[PDB]
Amino acid sequence: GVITCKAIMLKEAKLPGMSYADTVQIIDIQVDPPQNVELRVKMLCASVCRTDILTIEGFMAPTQFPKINGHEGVGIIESMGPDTKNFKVGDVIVAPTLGECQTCSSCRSGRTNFCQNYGANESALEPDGTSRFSYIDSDGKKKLLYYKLGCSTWTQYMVVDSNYATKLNEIAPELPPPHGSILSCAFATGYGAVWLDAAVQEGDSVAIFGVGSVGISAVIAAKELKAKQIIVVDRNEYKLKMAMELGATHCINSEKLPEGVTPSQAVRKLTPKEVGVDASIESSGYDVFMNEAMKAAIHGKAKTVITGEGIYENDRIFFDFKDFLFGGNVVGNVTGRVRIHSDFPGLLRKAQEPVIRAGMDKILGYDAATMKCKYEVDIREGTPALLKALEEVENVDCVKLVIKLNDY
Amino acid sequence: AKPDKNGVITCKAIMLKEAKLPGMSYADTVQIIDIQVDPPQNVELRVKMLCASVCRTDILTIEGFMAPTQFPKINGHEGVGIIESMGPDTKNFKVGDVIVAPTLGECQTCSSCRSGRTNFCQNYGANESALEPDGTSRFSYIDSDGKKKLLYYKLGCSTWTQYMVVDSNYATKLNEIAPELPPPHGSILSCAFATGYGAVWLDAAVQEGDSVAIFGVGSVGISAVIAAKELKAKQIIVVDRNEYKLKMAMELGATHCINSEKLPEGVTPSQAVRKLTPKEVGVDASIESSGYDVFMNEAMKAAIHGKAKTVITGEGIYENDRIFFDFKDFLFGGNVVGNVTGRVRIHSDFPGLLRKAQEPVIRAGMDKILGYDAATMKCKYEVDIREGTPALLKALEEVENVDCVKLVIKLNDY
Ligand SMILES: NC(=O)c1ccc[n+]([C@@H]2O[C@H](COP(=O)([O-])OP(=O)(O)OC[C@H]3O[C@@H](n4cnc5c(N)ncnc54)[C@H](O)[C@@H]3O)[C@@H](O)[C@H]2O)c1
Ligand SMILES: NC(=O)c1ccc[n+]([C@@H]2O[C@H](COP(=O)([O-])OP(=O)(O)OC[C@H]3O[C@@H](n4cnc5c(N)ncnc54)[C@H](O)[C@@H]3O)[C@@H](O)[C@H]2O)c1
Ligand SMILES: [Mg+2]
Numbered sequence: 065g066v067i068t069c070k071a072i073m074l075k076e077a078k079l080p081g082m083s084y085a086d087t088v089q090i091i092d093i094q095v096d097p098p099q100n101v102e103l104r105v106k107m108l109c110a111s112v113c114r115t116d117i118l119t120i121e122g123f124m125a126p127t128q129f130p131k132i133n134g135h136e137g138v139g140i141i142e143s144m145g146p147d148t149k150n151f152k153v154g155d156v157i158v159a160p161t162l163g164e165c166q167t168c169s170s171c172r173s174g175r176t177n178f179c180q181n182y183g184a185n186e187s188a189l190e191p192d193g194t195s196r197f198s199y200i201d202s203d204g205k206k207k208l209l210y211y212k213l214g215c216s217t218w219t220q221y222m223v224v225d226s227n228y229a230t231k232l233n234e235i236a237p238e239l240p241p242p243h244g245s246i247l248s249c250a251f252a253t254g255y256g257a258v259w260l261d262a263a264v265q266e267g268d269s270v271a272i273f274g275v276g277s278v279g280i281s282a283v284i285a286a287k288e289l290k291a292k293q294i295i296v297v298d299r300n301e302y303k304l305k306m307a308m309e310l311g312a313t314h315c316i317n318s319e320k321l322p323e324g325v326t327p328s329q330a331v332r333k334l335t336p337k338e339v340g341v342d343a344s345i346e347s348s349g350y351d352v353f354m355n356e357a358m359k360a361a362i363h364g365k366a367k368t369v370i371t372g373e374g375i376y377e378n379d380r381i382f383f384d385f386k387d388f389l390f391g392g393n394v395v396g397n398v399t400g401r402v403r404i405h406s407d408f409p410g411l412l413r414k415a416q417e418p419v420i421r422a423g424m425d426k427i428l429g430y431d432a433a434t435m436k437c438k439y440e441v442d443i444r445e446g447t448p449a450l451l452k453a454l455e456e457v458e459n460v461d462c463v464k465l466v467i468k469l470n471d472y
Numbered sequence: 473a474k475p476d477k478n479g480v481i482t483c484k485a486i487m488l489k490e491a492k493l494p495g496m497s498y499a500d501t502v503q504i505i506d507i508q509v510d511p512p513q514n515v516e517l518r519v520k521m522l523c524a525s526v527c528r529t530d531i532l533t534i535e536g537f538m539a540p541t542q543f544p545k546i547n548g549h550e551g552v553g554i555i556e557s558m559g560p561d562t563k564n565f566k567v568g569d570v571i572v573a574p575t576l577g578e579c580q581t582c583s584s585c586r587s588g589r590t591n592f593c594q595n596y597g598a599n600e601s602a603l604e605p606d607g608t609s610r611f612s613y614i615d616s617d618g619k620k621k622l623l624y625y626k627l628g629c630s631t632w633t634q635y636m637v638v639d640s641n642y643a644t645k646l647n648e649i650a651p652e653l654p655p656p657h658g659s660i661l662s663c664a665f666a667t668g669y670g671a672v673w674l675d676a677a678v679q680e681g682d683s684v685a686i687f688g689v690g691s692v693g694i695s696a697v698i699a700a701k702e703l704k705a706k707q708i709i710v711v712d713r714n715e716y717k718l719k720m721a722m723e724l725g726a727t728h729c730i731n732s733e734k735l736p737e738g739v740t741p742s743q744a745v746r747k748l749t750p751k752e753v754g755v756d757a758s759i760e761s762s763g764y765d766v767f768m769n770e771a772m773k774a775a776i777h778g779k780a781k782t783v784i785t786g787e788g789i790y791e792n793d794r795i796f797f798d799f800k801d802f803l804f805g806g807n808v809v810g811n812v813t814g815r816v817r818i819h820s821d822f823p824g825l826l827r828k829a830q831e832p833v834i835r836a837g838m839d840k841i842l843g844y845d846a847a848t849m850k851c852k853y854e855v856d857i858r859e860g861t862p863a864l865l866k867a868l869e870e871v872e873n874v875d876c877v878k879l880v881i882k883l884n885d886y
């Protein structure tokens with residue numbers, strides 16, 4: 065059967081000068097039943113990744129409008145296509161951008177999550193060029209809606225290929241929805257960038273450039289892995305203070321440095337003999353911080369892990385060439401290199417330990433008694449409340465906005 | 473080649489007066505002169521140079537690369553020679569040892585050395601000052617006013633001179649492992665050959681059955697081909713615009729060649745490389761050895777997402793001293809490292825490279841790079857520092873000859 069539900073439609077890219085009102089609306093959509101190995105999923109909540117706002121601005125979607133937004137969220141399996149294996153109706157799942165076939169040479173390497181068989185669905189469509197999402201326009205015509213990539217989370221019901229899904233309910237039966245939501249992107253990204261990609265060991269020094277939800281997740285990982293030194297860099301004093309409270313040892317307000325002192329110079333001055341850090345994480349989306357993160361790393365030895373995204377002129381980023389040749393080591397990172405079968409189960413177990421749960425609670429501003437987050441909007445309460453919430457994503461103390469989609 | 477009563481040697485060296493900026497000539501800045509080489513101090517080696525050989529970075533140095541204030545200088549970082557004398561604190565070297573001394577030493581005690589996975593030593597890093605730590609230089613000359621003037625190094629030393637002084641922490645010896653290795657082979661082991669060979673062997677960690685792409689088959693890239701063939705790569709794809717050097721790469725084990733200037737409309741070099749791989753997945757290892765900023769991005773893009781490493785060896789004078797990467801490709805599995813001297817650590821890795829260099833197939837490859845004639849000990853492109861500046865200027869222009877892979881500068885009798 066076809067489900068009618070609420071979803072957040074993006075009519076067109078919000079280009080500079082345009083408002084959220086110009087492009088973002090809560091509408092009724094039609095969600096087709098799942099086919100093949102798909103899950104149709106009753107969404108509990110989505111949470112707002114900075115990449116969700118980039119999507120609203122047209123990021124990676126030159127033609128793929130109108131769409132339903134969102135890649136960060138959690139929900140419950142309502143129904144499955146006839147070929148689906150290893151899932152049941154009622155399982156709680158997240159479905160990030162990359163699957164894990166376990167047989168391709170990338171999977172078999174043991175050192176990456178960039179699966180050759182279950183890669184990013186850049187088409188924002190089913191492989192036959194159709195979509196499980198449609199709506200009736202004010203002209204009465206049935207119109208296609210694009211996904212974000214393989215799915216959209218800013219909807220009461222989504223459909224996703226089960227080769228991208230991983231279940232929460234067996235390991236973490238009591239995990240609240242907003243915590244499941246941040247495990248699907250922001251928290252897996254920051255935690256994994258430190259744990260898996262930079263491979264932080266006890267006694268290592270770490271620099272994190274940008275302490276939004278991703279960078280704070282990285283601080284939580286660095287503290288858990290017993291980093292000797294955790295340096296955070298941002299312009300936002302509220303989030304720097306939150307980073308310090310959750311384990312960071314030194315903070316730098318990049319907008320308060322002297323004009324002649326770069327962020328990388330300030331970071332290196334905190335390290336013995338100005339040698340730099342064992343691990344350098346960028347989690348800002350500021351193209352300048354991608355270059356500064358590369359420079360703050362110990363030449364050759366240290367890895368710089370780039371998680372940041374933004375809308376860059378010619379879709380290009382830059383590095384200072386001499387500092388790059390003489391020991392730069394830079395990797396692109398998607399979802400913290402957290403492989404959905406090999407790594408995610410272990411991350412889920414770790415997320416339930418009390419200090420890690422306390423860190424996720426602080427990111428979210430979660431109240432256990434009411435199951436409310438500090439910044440939360442409900443899709444059932446109208447487009448104006450949503451437009452205000454999306455503006456308030458820029459509020460100094462908004463770390464993670466949660467979009468409630470159904471009763472918990 | 474004999475010191476005066478104060479231990480000072482007078483010899484020939486190639487002086488760079490100032491940066492050769494765009495539109496300037498070799499004649500504007502390059503001159504063979506008589507210099508005074510002071511005796512070695514502390515742990516220094518004073519080295520009778522046999523030959524230097526011309527790395528593209530030597531030409532970038534003529535053009536002002538990494539030397540905003542460090543003129544006049546003696547050029548050169550690629551060469552080999554014999555210890556003539558040592559500072560009083562020197563350990564583990566003897567007068568008569570044959571040495572090379574690249575940009576990075578190996579202290580074996582810093583956290584970078586102890587990692588086992590890099591040559592960027594914290595204690596013996598690149599000497600960017602082009603001077604002694606006290607602001608002096610072992611090199612001077614008497615100018616036309618009769619005044620004694622300082623000459624900068626390249627970095628920790630200069631090779632375009634009959635006599636060089638270098639901190640012994642940067643040196644590694646050839647004569648115990650490879651007593652019969654000829655000078656020009658020793659010279660390319662000091663930079664070009666270590667860089668291309670080590671980029672493949674150590675940094676990209678190429679395995680039997682791996683696919684490899686090499687962007688730029690000058691001496692460094694052809695050294696990478698030799699390593700990739702030795703390591704039994706399944707596929708070795710070379711990219712360049714120089715037909716002569718692409719053909720040489722094919723003769724030394726490349727499987728596929730791509731002329732970047734002859735690509736069909738709307739096919740990038742990364743797309744051309746990917747089209748030669750199963751399901752257009754790209755290569756297990758991507759080596760950039762061109763100095764072309766475009767190829768640094770194309771190399772990144774040709775790599776299998778996440779799994780493969782892109783090793784950047786290239787150097788150049790870039791707008792705003794920066795290079796660029798396509799962000800979407802970079803985020804979704806880009807993996808790029810800067811490489812100096814092939815990550816070949818002078819104590820831990822250089823000895824095995826040197827043993828490898830004496831194996832018949834590897835020696836044949838070095839001979840082809842050099843166009844070496846064992847009968848005459850002459851290379852195809854060779855100029856002698858004792859034969860005057862005009863011959864040197866002609867040789868520098870001829871670096872651009874399509875069949876010049878490695879110009880050698882003879883410095884002394886062998
Ligand atoms: N690679 C992935 O899988 C992945 C996953 C999550 C998010 N992202 C990207 O990673 C980044 C972090 O995600 P997020 O949701 O935490 O983002 P966010 O926007 O909530 O947080 C970014 C932080 O960086 C700081 N920052 C940004 N520009 C700055 C500047 N000019 N000077 C100083 N500080 C600056 C901000 O003040 C903020 O605290 C974003 O670019 C996002 O698009 C990617
Ligand atoms: N990282 C290190 O330790 C190290 C050591 C050696 C040299 N280098 C640098 O590595 C690079 C290779 O050194 P080399 O001595 O072999 O240089 P080279 O100039 O002899 O060879 C470079 C090759 O790349 C090709 N190339 C350059 N620009 C091109 C373009 N626009 N289109 C197509 N092909 C192009 C050339 O045709 C040539 O065959 C140079 O940039 C050099 O400065 C660095
Ligand atoms: Mg499908």
Ligand SMILES: [Mg+2]
Nearest residue numbers: 516604605639
């Ligand atoms: Mg000295």
Ligand SMILES: [Zn+2]
Nearest residue numbers: 113115249250
């Ligand atoms: Zn995200």
Ligand SMILES: [Zn+2]
Nearest residue numbers: 165168171179
């Ligand atoms: Zn796979």
Ligand SMILES: [Zn+2]
Nearest residue numbers: 527529663664
């Ligand atoms: Zn060189």
Ligand SMILES: [Zn+2]
Nearest residue numbers: 579582585593
């Ligand atoms: Zn060291």
